[PDB]
Amino acid sequence: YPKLTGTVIGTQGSWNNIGNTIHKAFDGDLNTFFDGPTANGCWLGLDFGEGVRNVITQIKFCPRSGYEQRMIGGIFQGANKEDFSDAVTLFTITSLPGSGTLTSVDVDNPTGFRYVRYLSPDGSNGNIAELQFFGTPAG
């Protein structure tokens, strides 16, 4: 299934205002990463757009090099409300992701979502180098 496109959404700003914003997780470079402005609460994802819903069949991600531990416990969610109050967890990261590569995980949830995100665990500053969603328009 193809890589899904959308509008990047999530935590605004970056650590020490250096500029490593959420957009660095979608730029195709595994060397660039999102470094959030706070230790906790950081998240990033996509809005596929009004009236657009995709079924998610796979997620790929790559940790920030040297900070792979900061992804453990992170979750990926799908939702149809931008505040994620109706979210369901699509996958939970429970082991250390390999450095410098995209780890691919299958998703088995038939629901169509307008919104998807990665919700980072405490102490991570949202650290992630790259994030990709795959799937198909909801029937």
Ligand X SMILES: OC[C@H]1O[C@H](OC[C@H]2O[C@@H](O)[C@@H](O)[C@@H](O)[C@@H]2O)[C@H](O)[C@@H](O)[C@H]1O
Partner in contact with 29, chosen from Ca ion, ligand X, none, beta carbon below 5 to 8 Å by kind: Ca ion
Contacting range for Ca ion; rule: CB under 5 A; set: 20-28, 76-84, 98-106, 120-128: 20-28
Least distance to ligand X, CB of residue 22, Å: 14
CB closer to ligand X, 15 vs 76: 15
Please report, as residue ranges, which positions from 26 to 55 form the binding site for ligand X (by CB under 6 A).
35
Site string for ligand X, 54-93 (x = CB under 6 A): ----------------------------------------
Written as one string, the DSSP assignment of the chain is: -PBP--EEEE--S-GGGSS--GGGGSSS-TT--B--SSSSS-EEEEE--TT--EEEEEEEEEPPTT-GGGGTT-EEEEESSTT-TT-EEEEE--SPPPTTS-EEEE-----EESEEEEEPPTTSTT-BSEEEEEEEE--
Residue type, 36: G
Query: Residue 35 touches which of Ca ion, ligand X, none (CB < 5 to 8 A by kind)?
Result: ligand X
Q: Enumerate binding residues for ligand X (CB under 6 A).
A: 15, 35, 125
